[PDB]
Design a protein around this ligand. Structure first.
Ligand SMILES: [Zn+2]
Lengths: 263, 605, 15, 390
């Protein structure tokens, strides 16, 4: 079976900027597209299961743990729960000018441990191939690099595919993240037609991904820079403690304070 | 007694079911049949108890089958298990209770034991009994009075009529006790026989010896052990433990020679103290006590030579502490059974490996010697590695068209010589022998028909042995088979199964069979059971092939003949066709050769 | 080496 | 299979059968691997696309999956070339289906199916139902020929009996639908209910028959609401087999004992166990009744006690081979109706007749050396007409 997890980056600052701009695309339509994708994923098979996480500047919250219109009961429950919870989360939110960058590493950590819990609980008879369909919507924060890299490596070890679906911006950190675990990287330039991209590129599971034509991976610039400048550097002088990429040879690296002996 | 709509008897209203049936792994049918589970954690304890109180009839890998009878219950009482001592534990183990019929049967069988005891002293057999009422109500029929020679009440009885009186008592419900109190016996001085430390006793051998010596007094009974399991060693150990005069009875010259060799090898008793009461050669039988002789000589009915007459008179006059009888399956024969009454012995132990026969005379052994004390578990021995694992197989050979035509056309019994000799089985045996010869496996071909054996042997230029074959040539052929690498196969006749000490063989092909003879089948199978130096049970190094001809009486004979082996647990795999036979070149590859063989068979007359 | 024959390793019946 | 059942249908019945509530989802779940993905893709397109795109939309490796899926869905007629847009009706229904618009029950189903099988076998005590009896009789697994006497069991009946519960029930329902069309019950309406279960007068009668089979149970004196059992949507063994053709079955339900007795001789019956022997008599009796060794072997394997699961194979080779050989011996002599020829003046005419018979499929066997052949009576008329025509 397959356990899909949709990590939606519903950043109020950026989505409300879109709302003020009165652009055609809106967070409501984005949520509807994600809902349709999840419904289709479960539609694929009974054993398949899904979950949803929404990201905010403060924290990240799960959007998912009759036939009034003649509807499938389970998908109806999914629609109702996600709609109600997303509206509640968006309506209620404190204001903090100091912190405005969208948070994604914590949401991904929650997704990873949730997948681990489900893998533990599920019977050993059936093998579960989990996936994380990250949908970024705003620029990433520099300070989150370390934790995001930790969670990416944990996902690599635990065999989960991070399929990135960044839109309106190309996050180098996120493309690097999905490249490590082999997840697909699609940058949709037509936001209104986003759902067609999901039902083709992302929706097919790892089982059938190899035997299918999908957009080629984007080249990844594995840049390095010294802690002085944050500029690209091809040669780094790291020590045996900090393991930090530096500018030039120095008597002692500041982040270490070690008694380096010249020679 | 109650029959369901199907063949099986109904016991829904007969006995109840224990609540902890899963814990209890034992079943008890009203007829006495018991079905034990080989997968239960307490399987070993249940096996020990059920072997103690009952005799196996079928012991497959999963569910063992036992049945108890009067003789088995008497053996249990002899080893000292009281009616309560057995029934309480039987009820505890049983997952469905104990039927009242089995309860009363056990009670009656146990109580009707020990009341009448038979003790021979000063060449006189006294029927002792502490209770006098047993004799008072046992002297109703006139056979006892005519039999008798013309507390603790005892009376002398005639030597010749002992067998008749014993078989009468068995159905009279007062079994006789043949226990020998060798520990307390001053009439016959103990013999200087001891067991050297070199001899090693296997756990099953020790268990059988313990069951025999359930108490300080040795019990007379029959212990069935595989020929390769060391039954000779068990008998030697029994004699050494008895420490009294022992008379071992073989069935042939080879048997007596092997018994003397085993005695010398495993017992410290000196060579001069052992004699061979054999016509071919003698070692002063009267001189020493420990003796080895033969049923034919002891029961010889015609004129007796002077020296043999003197020896026989000495044997009759003397009293024997132990009477070992090998191959007890032949005892119920007229002349062989006469030896039991001819000779006097306190306990007559019986050893054998194939205790099966067609005529219902095996039951007579229970009173002729005693209850079947022990019967080794062949499957357990195979698992423990004491006996080489055997891949029992039955190669089906389609009968050739013409041969089948004459076979079916003639209503006479030339079919025995016909279906035993057909081109298909000839080619099958040739190909099998070639395959094993290139595999360096020792082959012992068997065939009842000497004519067919000779034809096959001449066609394959192999050294066939048979009855009137010279002893020197027989020994030469056996030595060549054992030593010479260039030869790895011997074609033995029925004489092979009688008695021999042959080298361990990796395969045993049987082209022909004497008939539906479980005795012969087991006897021939025992040849390859000889465990190798470093083999393994799962390797299935030993192979047994019983070639049969399809759509012929040989199929019925083979099916009726493999009953004992399947009861032990061996699974006979059927082989319709052999891979590589078509590519391999074999004789009788053309119609003409089959035609000349058929013409020779017809001219055989 | 010393492997069992084919006709004993697997059933030779046409089924 | 359900795929076979749906493939054996016309477009006119297919589009009607594609009802809004469930059919578009039940048939979707059938889509084995990839056709699901394509259905989701072109669920939102109102413009047909060229076939070359679908052809090249699967890598060179594993293309056979592409062709087989395309053929299966072409048979289902989910789309039309229109020159591959999906059917508008199916598209709308699928969009409406995608964000648009018990412990006692299983025991009840088990008991009802067990009593049904008891009636199927010659059990003196069984549930009585004339409609069920006649339905089973016309299903092809039972023939009565005498209303007064209880119906017997045909050859196919034993084969159906020895099948496992899932396949047994599935085949029974397949025959139910096939006979429903014959009796006049609309096939589409009854079929849609089965699909709806996994998520009118005819409906009431069909539900009554399903309840008689034990798949559903109203539990409220035949109310509108129903609670389907586990079998409506669509166990450890107990037999221990020895090497001496002895079966020890931990069976308390009489159905299992009857099934074992169908091909074995029963010896003892304990409260929680039964002993039987698989002998030539019983095995050949079953084979003559109609069973084949495959059903017996499969039945014993599926009802295999956990003790013998450790050994590989589970069923002993000797037992399996003996059963197979016993079945083969019965059909050693193969009978085939035919007509023989004699006195062929010339081999040219015989060869020409042989070619004609091969073309028409009439020939069954030929012998060139003896210049003769055998033809079935059905082709006897054809060959006789050819000979007359010269
Ligand atoms: Zn440092």
């Amino acid at each position: 079976l397959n356990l899909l997890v949709i990590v939606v980056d519903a950043n109020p600052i950026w989505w409300g900027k879109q709302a003020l701009k009165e652009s055609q695309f809106t967070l409501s339509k984005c949520i509807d597209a994600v809902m349709v994708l999840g419904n289709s994923h479960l539609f694929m098979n009974r054993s398949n299961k899904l979950a949803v996480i929404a990201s905010h500047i403060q924290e990240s919250r799960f959007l998912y743990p009759g036939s009034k219109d003649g509807k499938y009961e389970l998908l109806t429950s999914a629609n109702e729960v996600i709609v109600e919870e997303i509206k509640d989360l968006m309506t209620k939110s404190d204001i903090k000018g100091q912190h405005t960058e969208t948070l994604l590493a914590g949401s991904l950590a929650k997704a990873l441990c949730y997948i681990h819990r489900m893998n533990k609980e599920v019977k050993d008879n059936q093998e579960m191939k989990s996936r994380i369909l990250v949908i970024k919507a705003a620029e990433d924060s520099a300070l989150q690099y370390m934790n995001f890299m930790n969670v990416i490596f944990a996902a690599q070890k635990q065999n989960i595919l991070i399929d990135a679906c960044v839109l309106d911006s190309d996050s180098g950190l996120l493309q690097q993240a999905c490249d490590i675990t082999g997840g697909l990287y699609l940058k949709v330039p037509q936001m209104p037609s986003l759902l067609q991209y999901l039902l083709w590129v992302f929706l097919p599971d790892q089982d059938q991904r190899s035997q299918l034509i999908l957009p080629p991976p984007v080249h990844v610039d594995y840049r390095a820079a010294c802690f002085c400048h944050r500029n690209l550097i091809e040669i780094g002088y790291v020590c045996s403690v900090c393991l930090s990429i530096f500018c030039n040879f120095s008597p002692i690296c500041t982040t270490c304070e070690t008694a380096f002996k010249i020679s | 007694t109650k029959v369901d709509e199907y063949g099986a008897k109904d016991y829904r209203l007969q006995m109840p079911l224990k609540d902890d049936h899963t814990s209890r792994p034992l079943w008890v049918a009203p007829d006495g049949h018991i079905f034990l589970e080989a997968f239960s954690p307490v399987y070993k304890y249940a096996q020990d108890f059920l072997v103690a109180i009952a005799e196996p009839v079928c012991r497959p890998t999963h569910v063992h089958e036992y049945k108890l009878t009067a003789y088995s219950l008497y053996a249990a009482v002899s080893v000292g298990l009281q009616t309560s001592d057995i029934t309480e534990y039987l009820r505890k183990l049983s997952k469905t209770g104990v039927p009242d019929g089995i309860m009363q049967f056990i009670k009656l069988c146990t109580v009707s034991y020990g009341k009448v005891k038979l003790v021979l002293k000063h060449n006189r057999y006294f029927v002792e009994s502490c209770h006098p009422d047993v004799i008072q109500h046992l002297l109703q029929d006139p056979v006892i009075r005519e039999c008798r020679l013309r507390q603790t009440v005892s009376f002398e009885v005639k030597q010749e009529m002992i067998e008749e009186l014993q078989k009468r008592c068995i159905h009279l419900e007062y079994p006789l006790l043949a226990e020998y109190d060798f520990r307390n016996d001053s009439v016959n001085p103990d013999i200087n026989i001891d067991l050297k430390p070199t001899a090693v006793l296997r756990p099953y051998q020790e268990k059988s010896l313990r069951k025999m010596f359930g108490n300080g007094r040795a019990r007379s009974g029959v212990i069935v052990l595989p020929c390769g399991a060391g039954k000779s060693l068990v008998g030697v150990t029994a004699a050494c433990t008895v420490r009294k005069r022992c008379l071992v009875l073989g069935n042939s010259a080879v048997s007596v020679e092997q018994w003397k060799a085993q005695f010398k090898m495993w017992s410290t008793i000196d060579d001069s103290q052992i004699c061979r009461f054999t016509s071919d050669a003698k070692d002063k039988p009267i001189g020493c006590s420990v003796a080895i002789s033969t049923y034919s000589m002891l029961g010889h009915t015609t004129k007796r030579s002077w020296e043999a007459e003197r020896v026989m008179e000495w044997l009759k006059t003397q009293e024997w502490g132990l009477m070992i009888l090998d191959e007890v399956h032949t005892i119920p024969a007229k002349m062989f059974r006469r030896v039991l009454t001819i000779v006097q012995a306190h306990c007559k132990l019986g050893l054998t490996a194939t205790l099966v026969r067609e005529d219902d005379k095996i039951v007579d052994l229970n009173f002729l010697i005693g209850p079947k004390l022990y019967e080794a578990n062949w499957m357990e021995l195979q698992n423990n590695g004491y006996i080489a694992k055997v891949q029992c197989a039955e190669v089906w050979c389609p009968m050739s068209p013409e041969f089948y035509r004459e076979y079916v056309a003639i209503k006479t019994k030339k079919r025995i010589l016909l279906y035993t000799m057909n081109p298909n089985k000839f080619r099958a045996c040739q190909f099998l022998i070639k395959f094993h010869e290139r595999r360096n496996d020792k082959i012992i071909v068997f065939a009842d028909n000497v004519f067919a054996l000779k034809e096959y042997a001449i066609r394959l230029n192999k050294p066939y042995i048979y009855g009137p074959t010279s002893q020197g040539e027989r020994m030469q052929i056996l030595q060549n088979f054992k030593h010479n690498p260039k030869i790895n196969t011997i074609f033995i006749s029925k004489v092979g199964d009688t008695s021999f000490d042959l080298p361990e063989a990796n395969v045993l092909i049987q082209i022909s069979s004497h008939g539906g003879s479980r005795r012969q089948e087991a006897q021939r199978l025992g040849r390859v059971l000889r465990a190798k130096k470093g083999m393994v049970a799962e390797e299935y190094n030993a192979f047994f092939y019983s070639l049969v001809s399809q759509d012929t009486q040989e199929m019925a004979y083979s099916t009726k003949r493999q009953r004992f082996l399947v009861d032990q647990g061996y699974s006979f795999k059927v082989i319709t066709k052999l891979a590589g036979m078509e590519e391999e070149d074999l004789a009788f590859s053309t119609k003409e050769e089959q035609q000349q063989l058929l013409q020779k068979v017809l001219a055989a007359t | 080496a010393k492997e069992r024959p084919i006709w004993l390793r697997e059933s030779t019946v046409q089924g | 299979n359900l795929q076979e059942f749906l493939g054996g249908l016309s477009p006119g019945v297919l589009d009607r059968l594609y009802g809004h509530p469930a059919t578009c989802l039940a048939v979707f779940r059938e889509l084995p691997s990839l056709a699901k993905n394509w259905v989701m893709r072109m669920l939102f397109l109102e413009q047909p696309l060229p076939q070359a795109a679908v052809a090249l939309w699967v890598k060179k490796e594993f293309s056979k999956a592409q062709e087989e899926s395309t053929g299966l869905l072409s048979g289902l007629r989910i789309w039309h070339t229109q020159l591959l847009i999906l059917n508008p009706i199916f598209r709308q229904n699928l969009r409406i289906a995608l964000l648009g618009g018990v412990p006692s029950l299983d025991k009840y189903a088990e008991e009802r199916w067990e009593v049904v099988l008891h009636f199927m076998v010659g059990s003196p005590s069984a549930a009585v139902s004339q409609d069920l009896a006649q339905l089973l009789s016309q299903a092809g697994l039972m023939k009565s020929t005498e209303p007064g006497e209880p119906p017997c069991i045909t050859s196919a009946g034993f084969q159906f009996l020895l099948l496992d519960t899932p396949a047994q029930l599935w085949y029974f329902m397949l025959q139910y639908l096939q006979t429903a069309q014959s009796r006049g019950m609309d096939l589409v309406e009854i079929l849609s209910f089965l699909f709806q279960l996994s998520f009118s007068d005819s409906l009431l009668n069909f539900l009554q028959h399903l309840r008689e089979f034990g798949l559903v149970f109203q539990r409220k004196r035949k109310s509108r609401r129903y609670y389907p059992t586990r079998l409506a949507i669509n166990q450890p063994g107990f037999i221990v087999v020895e090497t001496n053709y002895r079966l020890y079955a931990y069976t308390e339900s009489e159905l299992q004992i009857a099934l074992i007795a169908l091909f074995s001789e029963m010896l003892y019956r304990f409260p929680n166990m039964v002993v039987a022997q698989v002998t030539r008599e019983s095995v050949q009796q079953a084979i003559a009744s109609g069973i084949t060794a495959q059903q017996i072997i499969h039945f014993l394997r599926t009802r295999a006690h956990p003790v013998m699961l450790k050994q590989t194979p589970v069923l002993p080779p000797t037992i399996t081979d003996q059963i197979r050989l016993w079945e083969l011996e019965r059909d050693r002599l193969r009978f085939t109706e035919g007509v023989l020829y004699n006195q062929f003046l010339s081999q040219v005419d015989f060869e020409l007749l042989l070619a004609h018979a091969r073309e028409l499929g009439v020939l069954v066997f030929e012998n060139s050396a003896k210049r003769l052949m055998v033809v079935t009576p059905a082709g006897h008329s054809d060959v006789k007409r050819f000979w007359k025509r010269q």
